[PDB]
Ligand binder design. Structure first.
Ligand SMILES: [Mn+2]
Ligand SMILES: [Mn+2]
Ligand SMILES: [Mn+2]
Ligand code: NA
Length: 347
DNA sequence: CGCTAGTCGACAT
DNA sequence: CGACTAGCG
């Protein structure tokens, strides 16, 4: 997530209602609804006690979209991307820590702080997501599990003309290159739409409204793939890309000391990490619903060599990718949990 | 001004 | 997997 990005391009936003997309298809980052729905029943999840509140919680939004004449495609997170594995490990550590700390604070009499701590121990499993999948198929709503991050999958679905908008709370989608992103959408249909074409309405951006320059800016500001340099946020990065009339980003990053008038020293780790980040934003593996094949988010440019993009995602046989995408195969144990078939009845 | 980083809402009773 | 704000350049 790009920290403070939404406030940064606030001028490119537009308070709309989902009715705007009536008779059209919209893909959804379901993790948001899953998380929020899981907050309501944090105790049950922390104790391991059975629950299904988040299911109905998601079904509220789903049935709402269906009521306003929208066709939603619920997209779920799949395998763990090696690029964002540090953050994953940290989040897991803090999850277990908050779990046990909650289990101990429950004994101090502070039931309030125990549940407050259980709110920060929410771990969205793939079983829950599968409950949501089945519940969605009950209403005939198409579901799709991304090979890796949901972000990339959604980005593909939006850039390939399969969907026109993306419902989410993550500003990461904008960096990937989504045309229209609906944020802050409530249970009634009220959300904030950000159109890429409106990026020109931002004075702070300047000539950084192109997808590539915008990507560079989002990366330099700090992302889940690469921590930003000490003292480099959105405005300074944007300033760099504004003042730099150079297609080669590498030399620019090397002369970041010259562009920003700051005595900046760039480690060798950061250049490689940057190339990694950009290659991850560009060529992260997604799943084509039509051709049923594992493809990168974008067409492989002749610049980069695909054999050095293992961090962007590893390939598998497209049948396995299909069985994962349908949610039939477990993301973790790789074992068959279901046997749903779209043939014998999006694709 | 601009950026880091730590706090705490989100659900909902 | 986010929106504030104190604290500092
Ligand atoms: Mn993120
Ligand atoms: Mn995501
Ligand atoms: Mn993300
Ligand atoms: Na930053």
């Amino acid at each position: 997530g790009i920290q403070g990005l939404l406030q940064f391009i606030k001028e490119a936003s537009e308070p709309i209602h989902v009715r705007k997309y009536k008779g059209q298809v919209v893909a959804v980052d379901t993790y948001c609804w899953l998380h929020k729905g899981a907050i309501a029943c944090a105790e049950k999840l922390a104790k391991g006690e059975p629950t299904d509140r988040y299911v109905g919680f998601c079904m509220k939004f789903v049935n709402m979209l269906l009521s306003h004449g929208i066709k939603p495609i619920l997209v779920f997170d799949g395998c763990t991307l090696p690029s964002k594995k540090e953050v994953e490990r940290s989040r897991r550590e803090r999850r277990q820590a908050n779990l046990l700390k909650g289990k101990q604070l429950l004994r101090e009499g502070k039931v309030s702080e125990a549940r407050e701590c259980f709110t920060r121990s929410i771990n969205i499993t793939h079983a829950m997501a599968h409950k949501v999948i089945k519940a969605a198929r009950s209403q005939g709503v198409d579901c799709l599990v991304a090979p890796y991050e949901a972000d990339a999958q959604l980005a593909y679905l939006n850039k390939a003309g399969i969907v026109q908008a993306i419902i989410t709370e993550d500003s990461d989608l904008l960096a990937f290159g989504c045309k229209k992103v609906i944020l802050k959408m409530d249970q009634f249909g009220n959300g904030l739409e950000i159109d890429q074409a409106r990026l020109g309405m931002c004075r702070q951006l300047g000539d950084v409204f192109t997808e590539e320059k915008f990507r560079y800016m989002c990366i330099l500001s700090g992302c889940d793939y690469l921590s930003s340099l000490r003292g480099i946020g959105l405005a300074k990065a944007c300033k760099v890309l504004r003042l730099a009339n150079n297609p080669d980003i590498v030399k620019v990053i090397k002369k970041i000391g010259h562009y920003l008038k700051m005595n900046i020293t760039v480690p060798e780790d950061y250049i490689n990490g940057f190339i990694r980040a950009n290659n991850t934003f560009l060529y992260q593996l997604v799943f084509d619903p039509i051709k049923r094949k594992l493809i990168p988010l974008n067409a492989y440019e002749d610049d980069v060599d695909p054999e050095t993009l293992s961090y962007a995602g590893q390939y598998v046989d497209d049948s396995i990718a299909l069985q994962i995408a349908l949610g039939n195969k477990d993301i973790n144990t790789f074992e068959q949990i279901d046997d749903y078939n779209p043939d014998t009845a999006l694709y």
